[PDB]
Paper text:
Further insight as to the possible structural basis for a termination mechanism can be obtained by comparing the structures of isolated and actively copying Pol α, which reveals a striking difference in the position of the thumb domain. In order to adopt the conformation observed in ternary complex, the thumb domain of Pol α must rotate inwards by about 20°, a large conformational rearrangement compared for instance with the limited movement of the thumb domain observed in structures of isolated and copying RB69 Pol. In comparison, the structure of the isolated polymerase displays considerable conformational fluctuations, indicative of large-scale conformational changes and local loss of secondary structure that affect in particular the N-amino terminal region and the thumb domain.
Residue numbers in the entry: 349 to 675, 680 to 815, 848 to 1055, 1063 to 1175, 1186 to 1228
Write the structure that this text describes.
């Protein structure tokens, strides 16, 4: 009521200040964007006194020297008792440090940081010298992810023309900002982007041809997001891929065939200028897309740089007139920085992939099928193909393809709940939402410990069973063992605080602490996450309201993911909290448990088909779903009885299983039984529809509910019928077709005599027709000595009977039918 309130989403660093971007509510209950410039932030340095000296001795030595070097009239400093329990050898468990507050903003040498190994006769180590400004703020003020912030003493007249936000304010000190307990959040303005590019052979540059923008202005994460939500505004921007003008009648045809607005531009520079203007006015909190992080944002950024778009900064929320001077492998940092203020929701990055394990390539069409169970056949659009510069039909189809991708990306991101889950993960880890969305696990792993330890007066550090190959005729269950390590850490009280280890030699194996030692920080945290998860699952059993129930499920998953990710803290080599002695201690107990899990399985007359620290596959010996699940639960109880904290679950159910490796198999999963293939090249372009039809039919018959002979004879009968059908050419010519795209001119292909597509193309040239880079050649290997490449002819030519061209039975029965079936039907 007296304080400025804001829901913070993202941040950036500039001039040793911390800017928070967020939302503010207006008198009409509508939320607009806002930014807060936070001054007066300081590093918390801790100086460790030598055995004889004291914190006061330190005060008298460096405070004057620090004042002079940084040009400060005074420096807040006081003794403080802190604890250390990490990897540095000669630092005691508890000591009296001199806590020093060094402002990020200093008159002199602000950019220079104090090294940990600063020479002195009063102290021999210094912590926090290289602290990050965002890290300091978040830790000192106990900020746990995106939330509401009470900001007192906000200055509404200090900041001028600094952002693309509606409200700009500042504070003189970070203590003026505190988090509130409000559990709800404001609606987000989401903007889905789809970009189509053009490869420029001359400069090897990726240029932009079109951009589609789909706006969703009131996405609410408090309630579930309605399926197939329609955008409030849809707009497509485009420029000519070849000439300076479009085909005739494009605008009229677009108005007639395409949804939303379509804006035409004479060049790319005008299009990108318009794009930036639209971002500014739309002011999205979230930018959704497919492969934005590692592909399209880089293209977009560099093209804006190339064409010198003055309003490029609107991609983020901080206003810049110039690009970073060094804008190289560190382009990712510059782009990430310039986007600050708008969250990047990329369904195809590491974070997005982790939520969609059922995928394999994570292509837009594949994800749409997996997550939404809807089919969309992708069109390969190559704007090098001249047809787009003159054929108005072609252009319209291309734009339609872009518009569809833009809305599929949005729908997928809502369906897999990428925003709400990452938010919960961010609230649990206390890091930045953007870091969760675009980073690995390491980030979340790091901040959850930074918060836990600093809250309990601790100084934090400075920044297998081989697969049984073959067909399994009985139900096989994949048992989830992801809680293995976190249950080990908890059971055996493994922590940085409890395990004595040789810090001189990290290869020396330590021992688990005796029961007398109190629960450490890491096990206590894991125990809590596990308890909170139960508190939520209990509530679900009673909850009737689907809205609250769905919210519970999200919270529940978030807690599970946080706990199952804790091992990375001490396991990952490049972790701020890496500890090899601890990693070894947890990995060894992991082997003991899995080895015994095998014996437990065999004690139930079960066979382990495959296993690792993440999952164990067991053959139930049953040919019935009900029987199989009962066996699964029995094994679940058996494993929990021997390991009270280890709770495993049934992840997959294979009625039949053809196994090669963990991610290379074919099987009938149960959710209704369905065919599921993994790690096997099924939809490979090298193979024609006939070969794919045959391979599919072969699998279905093997995994069929029939005996081996009567079913395998069905295969032989099928192949024989196929062979006679091929030899007598009674199959549709389409089924023999093979596609092959030309990346360059067929004449410029070195070794084109071996490539069937290059031969077909060159033949079309010598005739008269035109074919350049970007043309897809569809051909058939015809019967005739001539090479296979010389016997290859365009599909449409073989379709005409008067041409007397027939498919070569030898090639198709051998290379297209025998070879694939041989690799599939071996065991």
């Amino acid at each position: 009521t007296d304080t400025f309130q804001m829901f913070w989403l993202d941040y950036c660093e500039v001039n040793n200040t911390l800017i928070l971007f967020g939302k503010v509510k207006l008198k009409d209950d509508n939320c607009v964007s806002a930014m807060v410039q936070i001054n007066g932030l300081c590093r918390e340095l801790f100086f460790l006194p030598r055995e004889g000296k004291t914190p006061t001795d330190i005060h008298e030595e460096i405070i004057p020297l620090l004042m002079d070097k940084y040009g400060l009239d005074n420096i807040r400093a006081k003794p403080q008792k802190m604890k250390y329990s990490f990897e540095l050898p000669d630092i005691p468990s508890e000591s009296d440090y001199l806590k020093v507050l060094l402002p990020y903003q200093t008159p002199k040498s602000s950019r220079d940081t104090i090294p940990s190994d600063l020479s002195s006769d009063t102290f021999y180590h210094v912590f926090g010298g290289n602290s990050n400004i965002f890290e300091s703020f978040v830790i000192q003020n106990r900020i746990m992810g995106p939330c509401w912030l009470d900001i007192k003493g906000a200055d509404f007249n200090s900041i001028r023309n600094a952002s693309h936000c509606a409200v700009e304010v500042s504070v003189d000190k970070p203590q003026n900002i505190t988090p509130t307990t409000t559990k709800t959040m404001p609606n987000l303005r989401c903007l889905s982007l789809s970009i189509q590019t053009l490869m420029n052979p001359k400069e090897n540059k990726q240029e932009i041809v079109s951009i589609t923008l789909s706006a969703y202005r009131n996405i609410s994460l408090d309630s579930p997001i309605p399926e197939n939500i329609k955008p409030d505004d849809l707009c497509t921007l485009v420029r000519p891929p070849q000439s300076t003008s479009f085909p005739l009648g494009l605008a009229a045809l677009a108005k007639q065939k395409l949804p939303g607005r379509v804006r035409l531009f004479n060049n790319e520079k005008a299009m990108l200028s318009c794009f930036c203007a639209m971002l500014k006015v739309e002011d999205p909190d979230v930018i959704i897309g497919h492969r934005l992080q590692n592909v399209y944002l880089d293209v977009l950024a560099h093209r804006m740089h190339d064409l010198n778009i003055p309003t490029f900064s609107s991609i983020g929320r901080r206003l810049r007139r110039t690009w970073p001077e060094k804008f190289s492998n560190m382009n990712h940092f510059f782009i990430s920085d310039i986007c600050s203020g708008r969250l990047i929701c990329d369904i195809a990055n590491e974070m997005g992939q982790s939520l969609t394990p059922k995928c394999q390539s994570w292509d837009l069409s594949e994800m749409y099928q997996v997550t939404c169970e809807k089919e969309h056949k992708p069109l390969d659009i190559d704007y090098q193909n001249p047809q787009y510069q003159n054929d108005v039909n072609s252009m319209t189809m291309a734009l339609q393809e872009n518009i569809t991708n833009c809305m599929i990306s949005a729908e997928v991101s809502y369906r897999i709940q990428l925003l709400t889950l990452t938010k919960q993960l961010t609230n649990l880890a206390g890091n930045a939402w953007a870091q969760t969305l675009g980073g690995t696990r390491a980030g979340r792993n790091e901040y959850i410990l930074l918060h836990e330890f600093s809250r309990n007066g601790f100084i934090v550090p400075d920044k297998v069973f081989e697969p049984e190959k073959g067909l399994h005729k009985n139900y096989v269950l994949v048992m989830d063992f992801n809680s293995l390590y976190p249950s080990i850490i908890q059971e055996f009280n493994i922590c940085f605080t409890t395990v004595d280890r040789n810090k001189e030699d990290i290869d020396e194996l330590p021992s688990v602490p005796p029961s007398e030692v109190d629960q450490g920080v890491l096990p206590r945290l894991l125990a809590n996450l596990v308890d909170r998860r139960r508190e939520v699952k209990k509530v679900m059993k009673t909850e009737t309201d689907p809205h609250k129930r769905v919210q519970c499920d999200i919270r529940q998953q978030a807690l599970k993911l946080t706990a199952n990710s804790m091992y990375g803290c001490l396991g990952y080599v490049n972790s701020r909290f890496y500890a090899k002695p601890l990693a070894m201690l947890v990995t060894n107990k992991g082997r003991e448990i899995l080895m015994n899990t095998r014996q437990l399985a065999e004690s139930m007359n079960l066979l382990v088909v495959y296993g690792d620290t993440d999952s164990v596959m067991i053959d139930t010996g049953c040919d019935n779903y009900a029987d199989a699940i009962k066996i699964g639960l029995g094994f679940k109880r058996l494993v929990n009885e021997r390991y009270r904290l280890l709770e495993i679950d049934i992840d997959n159910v294979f009625k039949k299983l053809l196994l090669h490796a963990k991610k290379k198999y074919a099987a009938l999963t149960v959710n209704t039984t369905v065919l599921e293939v993994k790690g096997l090249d099924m939809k490979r372009r090298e193979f024609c529809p006939l070969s794919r039809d045959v391979s599919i039919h072969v699998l279905n018959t093997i995994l069929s509910d029939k005996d081996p002979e009567e079913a395998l004879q069905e295969v032989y009968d099928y192949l024989e019928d196929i062979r006679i059908k091929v030899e007598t050419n009674n199959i549709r010519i389409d089924k023999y077709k093979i596609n092959m795209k030309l990346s360059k001119d067929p004449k410029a292909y070195p070794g084109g005599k071996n490539m069937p597509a290059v031969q077909v193309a060159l033949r079309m040239r010598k005739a008269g027709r035109v074919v350049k880079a970007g043309s897809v050649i569809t051909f058939v290997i015809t019967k005739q000595a001539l090479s296979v490449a010389e016997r290859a002819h365009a599909l449409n030519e073989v379709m005409i009977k008067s041409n007397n061209l027939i498919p070569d039975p030898q090639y198709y029965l051998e290379k297209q039918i025998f070879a694939p079936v041989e690799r599939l039907l071996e065991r």
